[PDB]
Write an enzyme that holds these catalytic residues in place. Structure first.
Site, PDB file in Angstrom:
ATOM      1  N   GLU A  55     -17.052  -3.740  25.315  1.00  0.00           N
ATOM      2  CA  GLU A  55     -16.290  -4.988  25.387  1.00  0.00           C
ATOM      3  C   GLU A  55     -15.097  -4.973  24.438  1.00  0.00           C
ATOM      4  O   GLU A  55     -13.979  -5.355  24.814  1.00  0.00           O
ATOM      5  CB  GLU A  55     -17.186  -6.186  25.067  1.00  0.00           C
ATOM      6  CG  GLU A  55     -18.344  -6.396  26.039  1.00  0.00           C
ATOM      7  CD  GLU A  55     -19.516  -5.473  25.758  1.00  0.00           C
ATOM      8  OE1 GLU A  55     -19.574  -4.884  24.652  1.00  0.00           O
ATOM      9  OE2 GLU A  55     -20.382  -5.343  26.647  1.00  0.00           O
ATOM     10  N   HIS A  94     -28.376 -14.201  25.699  1.00  0.00           N
ATOM     11  CA  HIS A  94     -27.306 -14.114  26.680  1.00  0.00           C
ATOM     12  C   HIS A  94     -26.656 -15.451  26.990  1.00  0.00           C
ATOM     13  O   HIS A  94     -25.519 -15.465  27.477  1.00  0.00           O
ATOM     14  CB  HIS A  94     -27.830 -13.520  28.004  1.00  0.00           C
ATOM     15  CG  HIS A  94     -27.997 -12.034  27.982  1.00  0.00           C
ATOM     16  ND1 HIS A  94     -28.700 -11.377  26.995  1.00  0.00           N
ATOM     17  CD2 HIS A  94     -27.568 -11.075  28.838  1.00  0.00           C
ATOM     18  CE1 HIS A  94     -28.686 -10.078  27.236  1.00  0.00           C
ATOM     19  NE2 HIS A  94     -28.006  -9.868  28.348  1.00  0.00           N
ATOM     20  N   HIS A 137       0.848  -1.190   0.000  1.00  0.00           N
ATOM     21  CA  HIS A 137       0.000   0.000   0.000  1.00  0.00           C
ATOM     22  C   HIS A 137       0.882   1.237   0.000  1.00  0.00           C
ATOM     23  O   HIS A 137       1.385   1.635   1.066  1.00  0.00           O
ATOM     24  CB  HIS A 137      -0.910   0.025   1.223  1.00  0.00           C
ATOM     25  CG  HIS A 137      -1.733  -1.207   1.390  1.00  0.00           C
ATOM     26  ND1 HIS A 137      -1.202  -2.405   1.816  1.00  0.00           N
ATOM     27  CD2 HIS A 137      -3.052  -1.429   1.188  1.00  0.00           C
ATOM     28  CE1 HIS A 137      -2.160  -3.314   1.868  1.00  0.00           C
ATOM     29  NE2 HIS A 137      -3.292  -2.744   1.497  1.00  0.00           N
ATOM     30  N   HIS A 174      -4.205   3.502  -3.177  1.00  0.00           N
ATOM     31  CA  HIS A 174      -4.358   3.008  -1.810  1.00  0.00           C
ATOM     32  C   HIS A 174      -3.590   1.712  -1.580  1.00  0.00           C
ATOM     33  O   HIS A 174      -2.908   1.565  -0.557  1.00  0.00           O
ATOM     34  CB  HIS A 174      -5.826   2.786  -1.469  1.00  0.00           C
ATOM     35  CG  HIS A 174      -6.022   1.749  -0.412  1.00  0.00           C
ATOM     36  ND1 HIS A 174      -5.917   2.032   0.933  1.00  0.00           N
ATOM     37  CD2 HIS A 174      -6.262   0.419  -0.500  1.00  0.00           C
ATOM     38  CE1 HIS A 174      -6.109   0.926   1.628  1.00  0.00           C
ATOM     39  NE2 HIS A 174      -6.318  -0.067   0.783  1.00  0.00           N
TER      40      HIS A 174
HETATM   41  C1  LIG Z   1     -23.303  -5.983  24.435  1.00  0.00           C
HETATM   42  C2  LIG Z   1     -23.854  -6.066  25.822  1.00  0.00           C
HETATM   43  N1  LIG Z   1     -22.988  -5.905  26.841  1.00  0.00           N
HETATM   44  C3  LIG Z   1     -23.509  -5.987  28.073  1.00  0.00           C
HETATM   45  C4  LIG Z   1     -24.837  -6.227  28.335  1.00  0.00           C
HETATM   46  C5  LIG Z   1     -25.356  -6.321  29.744  1.00  0.00           C
HETATM   47  N2  LIG Z   1     -26.221  -5.179  30.118  1.00  0.00           N
HETATM   48  C6  LIG Z   1     -27.540  -5.176  30.000  1.00  0.00           C
HETATM   49  S1  LIG Z   1     -28.224  -3.723  30.486  1.00  0.00           S
HETATM   50  C7  LIG Z   1     -26.663  -3.071  30.851  1.00  0.00           C
HETATM   51  C8  LIG Z   1     -26.503  -1.688  31.408  1.00  0.00           C
HETATM   52  C9  LIG Z   1     -26.674  -0.606  30.375  1.00  0.00           C
HETATM   53  O1  LIG Z   1     -27.403   0.482  30.991  1.00  0.00           O
HETATM   54  P1  LIG Z   1     -28.504   1.320  30.256  1.00  0.00           P
HETATM   55  O2  LIG Z   1     -28.528   0.953  28.821  1.00  0.00           O
HETATM   56  O3  LIG Z   1     -28.230   2.776  30.613  1.00  0.00           O
HETATM   57  O4  LIG Z   1     -29.837   0.878  31.006  1.00  0.00           O
HETATM   58  P2  LIG Z   1     -30.624   1.165  32.354  1.00  0.00           P
HETATM   59  O5  LIG Z   1     -29.726   0.534  33.460  1.00  0.00           O
HETATM   60  O6  LIG Z   1     -30.568   2.688  32.513  1.00  0.00           O
HETATM   61  O7  LIG Z   1     -32.008   0.610  32.283  1.00  0.00           O
HETATM   62  C10 LIG Z   1     -25.691  -3.983  30.594  1.00  0.00           C
HETATM   63  C11 LIG Z   1     -24.219  -3.822  30.772  1.00  0.00           C
HETATM   64  C12 LIG Z   1     -25.671  -6.386  27.188  1.00  0.00           C
HETATM   65  N3  LIG Z   1     -26.980  -6.627  27.295  1.00  0.00           N
HETATM   66  N4  LIG Z   1     -25.162  -6.300  25.943  1.00  0.00           N
HETATM   67  C1  LIG Z   2     -11.661  -4.068  10.444  1.00  0.00           C
HETATM   68  C2  LIG Z   2     -11.109  -3.956   9.061  1.00  0.00           C
HETATM   69  N1  LIG Z   2     -11.989  -3.935   8.050  1.00  0.00           N
HETATM   70  C3  LIG Z   2     -11.468  -3.847   6.820  1.00  0.00           C
HETATM   71  C4  LIG Z   2     -10.120  -3.774   6.554  1.00  0.00           C
HETATM   72  C5  LIG Z   2      -9.607  -3.671   5.145  1.00  0.00           C
HETATM   73  N2  LIG Z   2      -9.055  -2.335   4.818  1.00  0.00           N
HETATM   74  C6  LIG Z   2      -7.765  -2.042   4.843  1.00  0.00           C
HETATM   75  S1  LIG Z   2      -7.451  -0.446   4.431  1.00  0.00           S
HETATM   76  C7  LIG Z   2      -9.141  -0.140   4.230  1.00  0.00           C
HETATM   77  C8  LIG Z   2      -9.632   1.210   3.804  1.00  0.00           C
HETATM   78  C9  LIG Z   2      -9.622   2.224   4.918  1.00  0.00           C
HETATM   79  O1  LIG Z   2      -9.183   3.488   4.365  1.00  0.00           O
HETATM   80  P1  LIG Z   2      -8.306   4.520   5.152  1.00  0.00           P
HETATM   81  O2  LIG Z   2      -8.144   4.010   6.530  1.00  0.00           O
HETATM   82  O3  LIG Z   2      -8.896   5.916   4.939  1.00  0.00           O
HETATM   83  O4  LIG Z   2      -6.958   4.462   4.350  1.00  0.00           O
HETATM   84  P2  LIG Z   2      -6.287   5.126   3.081  1.00  0.00           P
HETATM   85  O5  LIG Z   2      -6.751   4.462   1.826  1.00  0.00           O
HETATM   86  O6  LIG Z   2      -6.684   6.563   3.169  1.00  0.00           O
HETATM   87  O7  LIG Z   2      -4.800   4.981   3.323  1.00  0.00           O
HETATM   88  C10 LIG Z   2      -9.870  -1.258   4.478  1.00  0.00           C
HETATM   89  C11 LIG Z   2     -11.350  -1.415   4.407  1.00  0.00           C
HETATM   90  C12 LIG Z   2      -9.269  -3.804   7.697  1.00  0.00           C
HETATM   91  N3  LIG Z   2      -7.937  -3.751   7.592  1.00  0.00           N
HETATM   92  N4  LIG Z   2      -9.781  -3.898   8.937  1.00  0.00           N
END
Ligand SMILES: Cc1ncc(C[n+]2csc(CCOP(=O)(O)OP(=O)(O)O)c2C)c(N)n1
Ligand SMILES: Cc1ncc(C[n+]2csc(CCOP(=O)(O)OP(=O)(O)O)c2C)c(N)n1
Ligand SMILES: [Mg+2]
Ligand SMILES: [Mg+2]
Lengths: 667, 664
Positions: B412, B474, B25, B260
């Site tokens: 996460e 879950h 690249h 690119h």
């Molecule tokens: C990707 C993901 N990570 C973690 C969880 C676990 N989880 C469920 S509700 C929650 C808290 C998020 O709080 P919010 O969306 O503000 O809800 P509230 O407590 O205010 O009802 C989490 C970590 C999930 N459901 N999905």
């Molecule tokens: C998560 C992820 N998805 C896709 C790719 C493939 N990929 C490599 S470079 C690129 C384009 C991103 O463009 P940019 O970061 O603006 O780079 P430029 O062409 O400007 O150097 C993609 C999709 C990757 N490396 N990682």
């Protein structure tokens, strides 16, 4: 009854159902009940007696832990979800599981739970509405016209996938997407300032959204005013930031994470009833409240009116109207069976040695002439994944609005969950590609498609060390095996242009679940097939080369390694050994075949088996057993030209023959 | 030479190296060369002769496809990376793989390629510098003080993980994090307006970053001025938005996605040389350009000055200084072997039927007293994952700056890649928890830790249908088997509080790769172990119940299902059958044991094997073969109380015994 009294029916149904279940989340339902009352009673266009009405507004509860909010709303407004269903909250085989599941309760538009995918499904639903409208609406005949409403919380906004979905939503100008943010300053760890301090209003303005700040989430007149200004904005999605108190009404647990995810308890529930002024026993809703919550009469009139508009549309545009009904129902065109068969047979009769990613593009080109419902795309990899066809029309906010292709940007997770929303919406068959490696960014959306039994086509190219110099961060090893483990996903790794056209055909025909289609960067030799072998590809595994009589050894191969298996079988055969070659484009599809067919491919009596695949080896013991051998990978790759890598990692005829002879000698 | 001529050395090395490989690249290295000349020659604090200098600034190329940019810089400033290495770009076993790889070339701080994870690793390194400075610096003795610089492009900013990492970076006030955005309007699909239109400046201001807008990425003076203002901001990370032309210098392919990711071509390279006024043949850099690019003299003086500060520090704080050296090297404390052993033996002697997530918290509590390098966290699930111990000090921007715990929020993927950066930095052993389901959010960061051989500790709780009513979105089914497939990851699924403590111990002791530790929400019964059984748990699988003489049936179970396997074996032994129970807390660890040990546990002549695990069944054929059985899962879960789910899915003694009789 007052609006607040009507909203309290949700609050009490929520805390009573959590209490009877001894499980669930009372806090967000109680916090969002006033917003829900305004939105459902004053704005939402829906018909409880036909939850599948094609032009209904779509509502999505993205903070899916607050599932009693949607269950209460569906019960109160007249859907086929009963008090008895609410009393079965979180109980085995009930209509009211702990997180709302598509297909379980009528009116649940998507399965949520994993934070961030709700709003992303909703973005897909709004893309599908806008695109279907662009494809089917005509002057005087606006048969596609509905909003997409989302409730979402702090967790949803922290997740990276919210940035993918909402950045794209702003670029595509999704004016009918309106999201209500439950800004209650609470997540599971407590008050969110310590780990979440975005200026969310400014963030969403940066995406090109309209933002309505600082709405009192417990003031119906304010929620109503905000929704009106949200609806008046036709060019941008809108985020309404509602200030709410989690667990509103609870004297001792409101405004705290103590109300997020535990039963309030009998004593607190009594204190809440009194602070709410609610005088009815658990699961008792006065008839007056049902009458004012009911959406049956408004919904029936809305649909009857749309049916009349559609009738007039059908007189002016008979083929559009038939295509609309067909595509919304998900059925394929009547010529699909004959044209896809004829295309596959043409390829079998006109061999070509091409990369299966090129065969994939060729299949798209042929099938897209038959399937106007294709809505394709790539996560910024069109020229590598080969997802454009000659009729691709990339969609933009004000250009190609009735187009058929999405430049998703570098957003694999967002693309995948958007495609789920497109599939749920109806009217399209979405496909979207990336490199196989970056399946891992989108992993849970793929699983979500399988759980929801949605026909989403996940396309992956550059499938092994065959991709060469980009090296081990890009070269898949364990990814195909990991996709194979997803229940109800069918994964295809075709070995030439013919298996590639058949994998596309089988994925298009699979209406009860998604498919993963895995293609190569490098050229693949086409295999000869009789008519009966060609018919058997769709069975997932079939006999490709056979010996006279019982085989002494069976080679099992997928994808780019089938030619290697054939060449090693040839060498052994020239020594007088009786060897069979099984090609296995889809282990998942093959596992579903009846036991007679599986025994005809892999006879139980022949335990000398060699599996060949440039992927992690541990997967293949299901098919080779203790007496077999796997010619696979057990390490990450290396950055080098592909031919040197295949030699380095043992994918040579010499090595395969040598390992085969060892098990023939019982060594 | 002028600054632009010096930057053009990067441009010509990039395009010549890509042309020789016929792969790579050229555009981004060419687009960013002027920025890199300013940052590296004027600001970066580093020593090419010691890439492991503890107080060096950290540079991260998050747009890792532009690998020739970092290889050119390393070569030009005097690292042990030669022209011959650049001539082996993308060739087998070279120090110059197509994407930069940690450990393959000196000075590469992390492996990039997967977009968005570079900047996220760099957020991790900036957290580690800030936290290590909070722990070890003393009045007059600022021995930890270095910046974290990142190059990133449009792909990185589009990825959701950039939102997780940069949101948290603003919240934690990472004033030493400075990022240069290669704002070139180009991604692989072409000009990005059709799919990427963020007001990026206003986005990053919403995260609490300082933003320097509209810097001409080809004007060294503006780049220098922006960087000075970035260094002056001590309380916030800074984004420097650099307008660049991809493939700068190529008359026909600059400003296009055509530059690119493919060789420019021999003819285009000749025209680029002419347009740049570059008169030297491929891989020829004049001595004057090497002399002005060299960082050897500046870097050696900078490290010597730091070595003198460290010596003064060790005079005043000898014990602190020895702790700094130990923790930066990654060695464990001298009393670790004895303290962890005593803790595990104490648990074996005082049985408790507790959830293994509680067993994990107990292990954290005991081990954190021994390991001040522990830097823990959870993704908004401290109360469910149980990651806090009594000494937890949650780190904030201006409070607990020398703390030891991170509230990661609901992020996460960002958590996991931040932990990777913390591990790469040195001085810490990071662990971070979420539900097992949501490792699918963080999947590629787990793989990257294994690829990079980093000791990152991934904690997962709520591991099966055992979690109950939250339901099939879950309830893990296939997640543990998928974790087991990752090369160089060791996945542990302990069956009680004792195996839980041993799993933590082995993960802490694994310096050459990451671990995944999988714990339950529901209570688990402690198993009896002799002293030799206790010792064998760290071998990944061991005999837990044995018959006299050769068994006719081997049960293999993990985690929450070991008690079911013991119960079913007792029912079968009471009928006279010879049955053995094997607990396999880590399949990966077991697989690495020598052939003699594996045969002692799973004798090849005993082909009647029943595996039991509340997870995807197909994984276990590797250990049971065609003639065994798996008491496993083959569907999604259901929303119901856990006890009902175990019956519904056949995790009962009667079902296990029935399947055992089918093969006996
Ligand atoms: C990707 C993901 N990570 C973690 C969880 C676990 N989880 C469920 S509700 C929650 C808290 C998020 O709080 P919010 O969306 O503000 O809800 P509230 O407590 O205010 O009802 C989490 C970590 C999930 N459901 N999905
Ligand atoms: C998560 C992820 N998805 C896709 C790719 C493939 N990929 C490599 S470079 C690129 C384009 C991103 O463009 P940019 O970061 O603006 O780079 P430029 O062409 O400007 O150097 C993609 C999709 C990757 N490396 N990682
Ligand atoms: Mg909240
Ligand atoms: Mg770019």
């Amino acid at each position: 009854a007052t609006r607040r009294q009507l909203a309290n029916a949700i609050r009490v149904l929520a805390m009573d159902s959590v209490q009877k279940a001894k499980s669930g989340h009372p806090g967000a339902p109680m916090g969002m009940a006033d917003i829900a009352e305004v939105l459902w009673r004053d704005f939402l266009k829906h018909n409880p007696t036909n939850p599948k009405w094609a032009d209904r507004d779509r509502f999505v509860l993205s903070n899916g832990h607050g599932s009693m909010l949607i269950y209460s709303l569906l019960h109160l407004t007249g859907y086929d979800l009963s008090i008895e269903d609410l009393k079965q909250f979180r109980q085995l085989h009930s209509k009211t599981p702990g997180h709302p599941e598509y297909g379980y309760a009528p009116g649940v538009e998507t399965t949520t739970g994993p934070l961030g995918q709700g709003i992303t499904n909703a973005v897909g639903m709004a893309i599908a509405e806008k695109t279907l409208a662009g494809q089917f609406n005509r002057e005087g005949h606006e048969i596609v016209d509905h909003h997409t409403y989302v409730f979402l919380g702090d967790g949803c906004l922290m997740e990276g996938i919210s940035h993918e979905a909402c950045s794209l939503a702003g670029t595509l100008g999704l004016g009918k997407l309106i999201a209500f943010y439950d800004d209650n300053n609470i997540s599971i760890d407590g008050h969110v300032d310590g780990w979440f301090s975005d200026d969310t209003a400014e963030r969403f303005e940066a995406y090109g959204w309209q933002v309505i700040r600082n709405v009192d989430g417990h003031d119906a007149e304010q929620i109503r005013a905000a929704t009106i200004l949200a609806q008046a904005e036709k060019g941008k999605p809108t985020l309404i930031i509602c200030k709410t108190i989690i667990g509103f009404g609870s004297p001792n647990k409101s405004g705290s994470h103590d109300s997020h995810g535990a039963p309030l308890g009998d004593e607190e529930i009594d204190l809440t009833r009194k602070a709410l002024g609610w005088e009815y026993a658990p699961f008792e809703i006065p008839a007056e409240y049902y009458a004012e919550w009911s959406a049956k009469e408004k919904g029936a009139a809305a649909e009857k009116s749309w049916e009349e508009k559609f009738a007039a549309y059908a007189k002016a545009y008979p083929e559009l109207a038939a295509e609309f009904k067909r595509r919304v129902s998900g059925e394929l065109p009547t010529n699909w069976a004959a044209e896809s068969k004829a295309f596959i047979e043409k390829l079998q009769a006109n061999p070509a040695s091409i990369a299966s990613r090129k065969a994939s593009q060729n299949a798209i080109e042929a099938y897209a002439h038959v399937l106007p419902e294709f809505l394709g795309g790539s996560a910024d990899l069109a020229s590598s994944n080969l997802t454009l066809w000659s009729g691709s029309k990339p969609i933009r906010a004000h250009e190609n609005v009735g187009g058929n292709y999405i430049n998703y940007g570098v957003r694999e997770f967002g693309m995948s969950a958007i495609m789920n929303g497109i599939a749920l919406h109806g009217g399209f068959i979405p496909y979207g590609a990336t490199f196989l490696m970056f399946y891992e960014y989108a992993h849970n959306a793929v699983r979500m498609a399988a759980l929801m039994k949605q026909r989403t086509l996940f396309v992956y190219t550059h499938d092994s060390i065959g991709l060469g110099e980009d090296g081990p961060t890009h070269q898949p090893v364990e990814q195909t095996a990991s996709l194979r483990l997803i229940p109800n996903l069918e994964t295809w790794r075709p070995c030439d242009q013919v298996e590639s056209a058949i994998a596309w055909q089988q994925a298009v025909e699979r209406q009860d679940g998604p498919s993963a289609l895995i293609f190569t960067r490098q050229n693949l030799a086409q295999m000869d097939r009789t008519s009966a072998q060609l018919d058997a590809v769709k069975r997932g595994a079939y006999v490709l080369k056979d010996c006279d009589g019982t085989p002494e050894l069976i080679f099992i191969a997928t994808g780019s390694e089938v030619e290697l298996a054939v060449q090693a079988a040839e060498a052994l055969s020239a020594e007088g050994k009786k060897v069979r070659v099984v090609s296995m484009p889809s282990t998942n599809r093959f596992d579903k075949q009846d036991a007679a067919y599986r025994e005809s491919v892999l006879p139980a009596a022949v335990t000398k088996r060699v599996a060949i695949e440039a992927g992690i080896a541990d997967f293949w013991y299901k098919y080779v057993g203790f007496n077999g051998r796997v010619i696979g990978m057990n390490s990450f790759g290396e950055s080098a030209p592909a031919d040197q890598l295949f030699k380095l990692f043992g994918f040579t005829v010499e090595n395969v023959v040598a390992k085969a002879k060892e098990i023939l000698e019982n060594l």
